[PDB]
């Protein structure tokens, strides 16, 4: 019974670990996108200025 | 079990058949396109045991079965096995009686007419469907994604169709039909895992490698940087549990497999690669079209889920593209499922209600009707 | 092996290259405009094996080569491959060092000037030819056909030019240039053979389809009637044998490929077809010119070999033309080769011996001289 | 005692090791790939008696030894035992110290990389060989057979490789490696002989069944017709004299055991046989390659030493192959020895002098170098 609960609890660990890994992969994907977007938001803010400068010029 | 005569939607790939009813945002279940057969002689009496197993049955009892797929790069060549897959899908799991529902099937626009004619024939002649439509996968991902324009790149299990659409129109001279998909990537991985000391040949082994790829692999934004690193350090290895308690670790093979999509030469294929075929589909379109397709590089199907692929494809096209042009990938979560989803949306559109082939039209017109009514 | 320092004549198209010596009746050798390169990793040691193969070598060893054509819709973009084609043509088959013989090369007048400048340059700067002359293919077509006046219909593998000439003079405002040619007709055939269940995508396969077209295709005088017949009976099907013993049976695709010349929408081209443009080239000329052009519609180059083409073109121009007027097509057996013949005729005319650029006038003026001395 | 500082060649398979000098005719000696060890308690003293026996020593004293094979399925798993086989091979029969002689070893391209790394490492670190090379058994088979083009069907002791080679190039994606070989045929025969009343379980018994197979079995060009008579009459039985004076005979089992090569399911393998793998290797090659591979199926290695195999294979591939096409088989008397023969040919070619890894290159790079320089 404990083993059956263990198997299910382990299954939950696996399902939850599954989700953990999936979220981790999504976390990293999103975080990697965050980072590329941090780079883009800054490059874009810089472009906001390069373009603003092209307008000023 | 449905309370309305909603159209049924089934996306029949070389991998899995996604199926459910029109109006939902997901299939009820995914039915691997597999029919299994025992490869051993029975010894015990009173064991039941059938000549064949289908879909999830085929995978669940796979330890003693040889498993085969009826679909070859998008075309069904084994119709007996697809009738079993379709029957199981409707009869046991979707809890559907096609006799009372229109059915929408999907297909690459570039496949032989024999497949679209035969799919139309089986739903009308074997399943007695009141109506049919076979839809284009470029179209279906675009509906699911909320787009009318873009290059649709499937990179699926079977085929990559590379089809540019503008304002809902096909631009056929710019289409790059490509004989490269996940089924080839899997075979490549089996050969490089053999190099590591793990030989994968038989069905159980083939299904394990497909599972390894699905859980461990990525394309890499920059292949050479990952290559050099993974080949130099264990910090890039990822483990996988084999069903018997043994384990395998995978290093640069983790990306060398997916890389074949960008480098087809890895499996002996003569091809531009998915980033060049995508590029050429943009490039071959008219000059006033190019800007809209550059901004709408549209994902479809699986493998588009690999880490680094949405960023890599955008970079690879940008590197080939003219300046000024803004290049963007549309990579929605409706990934690996967008073709089925598009089928749900399409089947349900008021503007599509007259696009359905009815049973009476089919019987009078014959099977060639799919050429005049669908595409 | 030639007994005189006559001009070398080479008609280098996007398909084939016709090479020989001026004053003769036919090219001495015909090569494809192809340079082949191995796409596989060598396994055995001491096997020889070239880095690149040229012309007939490229096709002969093609089983493991990717085959590239240096010419893109009539313009040479790959001059590394063309100097190999020229060196092979001159050194191995014509058995001549161009240093001892003047050379005539050919191109349409609307071909970017960069190509005729470079053709002049390759012979002077790489082969040290004592003199050069880049000829108009339409000029050569009319000499070969026995005309000074007429319409030159020259759809090739690259582009279609469509040019009226009267009393030896061009009427350039009446040239109807189209991006419609045999390479596109071949692409359409590959798509429709795919519709029939035979998918051809690799170099070997692309060459097979091109070969299928050359041997099986035709246009027919009446397209609607040929279409309706093919759709009704197996009597219009024709077989083709493939290199490995496979056999393909082809039906209306046999004329739907060629049909694109009249129906350019099949390949995504914005055009009314070759008969509209042949007709317009006559129409854009003065009415005292038109009568002679209508009566002297002259075919040259290839694709003119499709049975039913001389009659369909004469009928379509007649249908578009005013009544009373007599419309006639000249479609000589010296087809597909007549431009080479015209080259031989022009190079050897006494009235043309002052038209040659010497390696002196060229060196003093530079590459742009071709624009002032040739066309 | 040798008249040249030549290379040494050793075909170290999972069965036997063929060893001799490069540039000679054949191997000077052929050893079992066996290291034997006593399984009994000694009673007499001053009897000599080794801790381990190698090659022919292992078989000569086998009455009380357990015999182990350091190589399985094409790969060395016990490097210590192969060093022992080699010390004996080189110093006792070839009468050479590898310290002064470059040495060539062999493998299949799809064996784990560890095989090539340990073969290279043992010879450089325990023998101090001045140079090493690891060769492709398929290449060596092609040199011995007089081919540069064909499918090499090596049918060895532990693995069948099945690789297409064209004009000296590999077509690696088309390799159909099969987990069926001569060692499995022996175990199959032991089980069927048990059904006939002759059980074999220990090493002495296992070595004899392999000897029975080698002398009594054949494959038959047509197994069904062969069975119709072999299963009906004792006139088709053949007797073998066992070491202890007992006599064992084999009837239709005489060809049904070898038949496994055309029926892998007999040993629990998920495969249709060698002719299916031969055919698919041809199928995965380009259409302009296939014609030459159909005409050049090459048998090499042992287990091809079964009467009826050249004809059995021609029928079995012809049955799968397109009509019109000629299917041909190369099966020289240099069977089972052809890999060694190819080894001598390759090691001694002038074109191969730069293919060797020198000791200096090895010491600087380490054993992973074999993976980068040999092939």
How far apart are the C-alpha atoms of C329 and C294, rounded to whole Å? 8
Q: What is D136-181+271-332's CATH number?
A: 3.30.420.40
Q: Count CB neighbours of C249 within 10 A.
A: 12
Among B112, B172, B268, select the one facing C194 at the smallest CB separation: B112
CB C155 within 8 Å of CB C163: no
Q: Could you give the 3-state DSSP secondary structure of residue D21?
A: strand
Q: C142 — alpha (psi -120 to 50), left (phi > 0) or beta?
A: alpha
Q: How far is CA B263 from the centre of its chain?
A: 20
How far apart are the C-alpha atoms of D188 and D183, rounded to whole Å? 9
Cβ distance of B267 and D173 shorter than 8 Å: yes
Cβ distance of A25 and B307 shorter than 8 Å: yes
Q: Which residues of B touch A (CB under 8 A)?
A: 307, 311
Among D112, D175, D177, select the one facing B197 at the smallest CB separation: D112
Task: Please give the DSSP secondary-structure letter assigned to residue C335.
Answer: T
Q: Give the count of alpha carbons within 13 A of D107, CB side only.
A: 25
Which chain B residues have a beta carbon less than 8 Å from that of A28?
A: 307
Q: Which residue of C has its CA nearest to D322?
A: C245
Q: Which residue of B has its CA nearest to A25?
A: B307
Count of H helices and E strands in chain B? 14, 18
For chain A, the helix, strand and coil percentages under 3-state DSSP, each to the nearest 5 = 95, 0, 5
Which chain C residues have a beta carbon less than 8 Å from that of B284?
A: 268
How far apart are the C-alpha atoms of C200 and C207, rounded to whole Å? 9
Backbone angles phi, psi at C250, to 5 degrees: -115, 130
The DSSP bridge pattern shows strands B163-166 and D131-136 to be: unpaired
CB D332 within 8 Å of CB D359: no
CB pairs under 8 A between A and B: 6
Report CA-CA distances (Å) from A18 to A11, B274, B284, B336. 10, 30, 43, 18
**Radius of gyration in angstroms for the set of CA atoms belonging to chain D, rounded to a whole number:** 21
Superfamily (CATH H level) for C4-34+71-134+337-371: ATPase, nucleotide binding domain (3.30.420.40)
How far apart are the C-alpha atoms of B43 and A13, rounded to whole Å? 38
Q: C168 — alpha (psi -120 to 50), left (phi > 0) or beta?
A: left
CB C12 within 8 Å of CB C82: yes
Q: Which residue of D has its CA nearest to B185?
A: D173
Which chain C residues have a beta carbon less than 8 Å from that of B173?
A: 184, 187, 267-269
Q: Count CB neighbours of B278 within 10 A.
A: 28
Which chain C residues have a beta carbon less than 8 Å from that of B114?
A: 197
Q: Which residue of B has its CA nearest to C187?
A: B173
Q: Gap positions in chain B, given as the residue before each gap (C–N > 2.5 A)?
A: none
Tokens 């040798």 correspond to what residue? D2
Backbone angles phi, psi at B354, to 5 degrees: -90, 0
D133 touches chain C (CB under 8 A): no
Provide the shortest C-alpha distance from residue B153 to chain D (in Å). 25
How far apart are the C-alpha atoms of C125 and C309, rounded to whole Å? 42
DSSP-derived secondary structure for A29-54: HHHHHHHHHHHHHHHHHHHHHHHHHH
Provide the shortest C-alpha distance from residue A4 to chain B (in Å). 20
Among C43, C62, C63, select the one facing D139 at the smallest CB separation: C43
How far apart are the C-alpha atoms of B93 and C170, rounded to whole Å? 74
Q: Could you give the 3-state DSSP secondary structure of residue D36?
A: strand
Among B171, B179, B270, select the one facing C268 at the smallest CB separation: B171
Q: Give the count of alpha carbons within 13 A of C114, CB side only.
A: 7
Name the nearest CA neighbour of B136 among B166, B111, B103: B111
Q: Could you give the 3-state DSSP secondary structure of residue B45?
A: coil
Cβ distance of A25 and B311 shorter than 8 Å: no
Cβ neighbours of residue B336 under 8 Å, at least 6 residues apart? Answer: B301, B302, B304, B305
Interface of D with B in 68-87 (CB under 8 A): 73
Q: Give the count of alpha carbons within 13 A of B233, CB side only.
A: 6
Token pair for D100: 């002064």
How far apart are the C-alpha atoms of B153 and B302, rounded to whole Å? 10
Q: Does domain D35-68 have CATH number 2.60.40.10?
A: no
Neighbours of chain C (3+ CB pairs under 8 A): B, D
Token pair for D349: 């070619």
Q: What is the largest CA-CA distance in chain A?
A: 78
Q: In sequence order, what E strands does chain D have?
A: 8-12, 16-21, 29-32, 35-38, 53-54, 65-68, 71-72, 75-76, 103-107, 131-136, 150-153, 163-166, 169-170, 238-241, 247-250, 297-299, 329-330, 357-358
How far apart are the C-alpha atoms of C126 and C118, rounded to whole Å? 11
Q: Which residue of C has its CA nearest to D286?
A: C63
Q: Which residue of C has its CA nearest to B170?
A: C268
CB B37 within 8 Å of CB B51: yes
Cβ distance of D179 and B199 shorter than 8 Å: yes
Per the DSSP assignment, residues forming a β-bridge with B11 are B18
Provide the shortest C-alpha distance from residue D91 to chain B (in Å). 32
Q: Count CB neighbours of B169 within 10 A.
A: 11
C64 touches chain D (CB under 8 A): yes
Name the nearest CA neighbour of D136 among B191, C45, C49: C45
Backbone angles phi, psi at B280, to 5 degrees: -65, -30
Cβ distance of A28 and B311 shorter than 8 Å: no
Q: Which element (helix H / strand E) includes B93?
A: none
Q: Count CB neighbours of C286 within 10 A.
A: 9
Cβ distance of B179 and C199 shorter than 8 Å: yes
Name the nearest CA neighbour of C345 among C158, C104, C183, C109: C104
Task: Please give the DSSP secondary-structure letter assigned to residue C189.
Answer: H
Q: Gap positions in chain D, given as the residue before each gap (C–N > 2.5 A)?
A: none
Report CA-CA distances (Å) from D34 to C310, D31, D207, D343. 80, 8, 11, 22
Q: In units of Å, what resolution does this entry have?
A: 7.8
Interface of D with C in 143-162 (CB under 8 A): 143, 148
Cβ neighbours of residue D327 under 8 Å, at least 6 residues apart? Answer: D294, D295, D297, D314, D317, D318, D321
Helices (H), chain C: 56-60, 79-88, 113-121, 137-145, 182-195, 203-216, 223-230, 253-259, 274-283, 287-294, 309-320, 338-347, 361-365, 370-373
Per the DSSP assignment, residues forming a β-bridge with C75 are C72
CB B293 within 8 Å of CB B145: no
| Interface-testing mutation among C204, C242, C244, C246, with chain D (most D C-beta atoms within 10 A) | C244
CB D170 within 8 Å of CB C41: yes
D140 touches chain C (CB under 8 A): no
Neighbours of chain A (3+ CB pairs under 8 A): B
DSSP-derived secondary structure for B243-267: TTS-EEEESTHHHHTGGGGT-GGGG
Token pair for B300: 């479809």
Locate CATH 3.30.420.40 in chain D: 4-34+71-134+337-371, 136-181+271-332
Cα angle B140-B142-B144, degrees, rounded to a multiple of 5: 70
B203 touches chain D (CB under 8 A): yes
How far apart are the C-alpha atoms of C342 and C355, rounded to whole Å? 15
Tokens 């009372």 correspond to what residue? B100
Locate CATH 2.30.36.70 in chain C: 35-68
CB D120 within 8 Å of CB D370: yes
CB C347 within 8 Å of CB C114: no
Report CA-CA distances (Å) from B81 to B35, B41, B87, C364, D127. 6, 22, 10, 76, 59
CB D121 within 8 Å of CB D265: no
Q: B182-267 adopts what CATH topology?
A: Actin; Chain A, domain 4 (3.90.640)
Provide the shortest C-alpha distance from residue B153 to chain A (in Å). 20
* Residue B23: burial class (beta carbons within 10 Å; 0-12, 13-18, 19+): middle
CB D98 within 8 Å of CB D127: yes
Cβ distance of B201 and D171 shorter than 8 Å: no
How far apart are the C-alpha atoms of C181 and C159, rounded to whole Å? 5
CB C142 within 8 Å of CB C165: yes
Interface of D with C in 23-62 (CB under 8 A): none
The DSSP bridge pattern shows strands C329-330 and C297-299 to be: parallel
Token pair for D284: 């995965």
Per the DSSP assignment, residues forming a β-bridge with C105 are C10, C134
How far apart are the C-alpha atoms of C309 and C330, rounded to whole Å? 11
Q: Give the count of alpha carbons within 13 A of C164, CB side only.
A: 25
Report CA-CA distances (Å) from C158 to C16, C34, C76, C313. 11, 14, 11, 20
D291 touches chain C (CB under 8 A): yes
CB B112 within 8 Å of CB C196: yes
How far apart are the C-alpha atoms of C17 and C343, rounded to whole Å? 13
CB D36 within 8 Å of CB D122: no
Q: Count CB neighbours of D320 within 10 A.
A: 15
Helices (H), B43-112: 56-60, 79-88
* Crossing angle of the two packed helices D113-125 and D79-88, in degrees rounded to 10: 50
Which chain C residues have a beta carbon less than 8 Å from that of B179?
A: 199, 201
Among D169, D172, D349, select the one facing C38 at the smallest CB separation: D169
Token pair for D336: 């089972």
How far apart are the C-alpha atoms of D294 and B313, rounded to whole Å? 40
Backbone angles phi, psi at D103, to 5 degrees: -125, 130
Task: Please give the DSSP secondary-structure letter assigned to residue B90.
Answer: I
| Residue positions counted in chain C | 375
Provide the shortest C-alpha distance from residue C260 to chain B (in Å). 13
Contacts 24+ apart (CB under 8 A), C367-370: C367/C117, C367/C118, C367/C120, C367/C121, C368/C117, C369/C120, C370/C113, C370/C116, C370/C117, C370/C119, C370/C120, C370/C132, C370/C134
Q: Which residue of C has its CA nearest to B268?
A: C40
């Amino acid at each position: 019974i404990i083993e059956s609960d263990l198997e299910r609890a382990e299954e939950r660990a696996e399902l939850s670990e599954g989700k953990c890994a999936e979220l981790e992969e999504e976390l990293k994907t999103v975080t990697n996108n965050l980072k590329s977007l941090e780079a883009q938001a800054e490059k874009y803010s810089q472009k906001e200025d390069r373009y603003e400068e092209e307008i000023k010029v | 079990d449905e309370d309305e005569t909603t159209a049924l939607v089934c996306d029949n790939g070389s991998g899995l058949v996604k199926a459910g009813f029109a109006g939902d945002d997901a299939p009820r279940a995914v039915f691997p396109s597999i029919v299994g057969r025992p490869r051993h002689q029975g010894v015990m009496v009173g064991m039941g045991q059938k000549d064949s197993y289908v879909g999830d049955e085929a995978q669940s009892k796979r330890g003693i079965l040889t498993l085969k797929y009826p679909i070859e790069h998008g075309i069904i060549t084994n119709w007996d096995d697809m009738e079993k897959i379709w029957h199981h899908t409707f009869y046991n799991e979707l809890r559907v009686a096609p006799e009372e529902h229109p059915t929408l099937l999907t297909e690459a626009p570039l496949n032989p007419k024999a497949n679209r004619e035969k799919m139309t024939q089986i739903m009308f002649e074997t399943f007695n469907v009141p109506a049919m439509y076979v839809a284009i996968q470029a179209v279906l991902s675009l509906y699911a994604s909320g787009r009318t324009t873009g290059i649709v790149l499937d990179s699926g299990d079977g085929v990559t169709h590379n089809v540019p659409i503008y304002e809902g129109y096909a631009l056929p001279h710019a289409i790059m039909r490509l004989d490269l998909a996940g089924r080839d990537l899997t075979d490549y991985l089996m050969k490089i895992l053999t190099e590591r000391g793990y030989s994968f040949v038989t069905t159980a082994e083939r299904e394990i490698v497909r599972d390894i790829k699905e859980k461990l692999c990525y394309v890499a934004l920059d292949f050479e940087n990952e290559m050099a690193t993974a080949a130099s350090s264990s910090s890039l290895e990822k483990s996988y549990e084999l069903p018997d308690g043994q384990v395998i670790t995978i290093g640069n093979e983790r990306f060398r497999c997916p890389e074949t999509l960008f480098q087809p030469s890895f499996i002996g294929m003569e091809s531009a690669g998915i980033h060049e075929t995508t590029y050429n589909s943009i490039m071959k379109c008219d000059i006033d079209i190019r800007k809209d397709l550059y901004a709408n590089n549209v994902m479809s199907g699986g493998t588009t889920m690999y880490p680094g692929i949405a960023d890599r494809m955008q970079k690879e096209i940008t590197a080939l593209a003219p300046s000024t042009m803004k290049i963007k990938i549309i990579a929605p979560p409706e990934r690996k499922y967008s073709v089925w989803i598009g089928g749900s949306i399409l089947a349900s559109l008021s503007t599509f209600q007259q696009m359905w082939i009815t049973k009476q039209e089919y019987d009078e017109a014959g099977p060639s009707i799919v050429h005049r009514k669908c595409f």
